[PDB]
Amino acid sequence: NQIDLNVTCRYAGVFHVEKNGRYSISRTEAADLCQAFNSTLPTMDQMKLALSKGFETCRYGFIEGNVVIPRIHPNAICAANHTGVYILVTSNTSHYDTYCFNASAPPEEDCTSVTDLPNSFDGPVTITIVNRDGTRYSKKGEYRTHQEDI
Numbered sequence: 001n002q003i004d005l006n007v008t009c010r011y012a013g014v015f016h017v018e019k020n021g022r023y024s025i026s027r028t029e030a031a032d033l034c035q036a037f038n039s040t041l042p043t044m045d046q047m048k049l050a051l052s053k054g055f056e057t058c059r060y061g062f063i064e065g066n067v068v069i070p071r072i073h074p075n076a077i078c079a080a081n082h083t084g085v086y087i088l089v090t091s092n093t094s095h096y097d098t099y100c101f102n103a104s105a106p107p108e109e110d111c112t113s114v115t116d117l118p119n120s121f122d123g124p125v126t127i128t129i130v131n132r133d134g135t136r137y138s139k140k141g142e143y144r145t146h147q148e149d150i
């Protein structure tokens with residue numbers, strides 16, 4: 001009864017979250033996950049500003065309306081060598097990572113660790129935040145409000 005949430009640096013408040021290091025988050029779970037970080041799914045405009053501050057990943061994740069990958073450097077294995085906010089057009093499947101937006105974060109690059117999941121609710125799950133530098137924070141709780149996600 002354990003969930004790992006791997007989180008990135010924030011860029012203009014936007015960050016990437018993956019669950020157990022594999023694509024495994026539904027659209028409903030993504031919204032709930034961001035809410036647990038006192039965050040929201042980013043708008044396209046928010047994500048484009050994050051990109052302009054240095055944000056890129058090699059992973060599909062939800063934003064409010066689309067599934068995207070922010071890309072600064074062309075890479076043939078990430079978003080078919082595209083740059084900019086690459087939008088996923090055609091897929092059979094529904095589970096990705098997510099992006100989240102925290103308005104209270106610093107305006108540019110914030111590569112400090114995340115040490116809390118402030119808006120998690122009471123629950124039985126051991127939830128571990130895992131930073132890219134390995135730094136961890138664990139707590140017992142839950143964040144999923146839809147039964148189909150559990």
Ligand SMILES: Cc1c(N)ccnc1CN1CCc2cccc(N)c2C1
Pocket residue numbers: 006007008018021022059130131132133
């Ligand atoms: C690189 C990679 C992959 N090959 C498959 C799935 N996910 C990733 C990206 N992950 C890799 C693992 C990890 C651990 C802690 C924080 C962060 N941000 C990350 C980012």
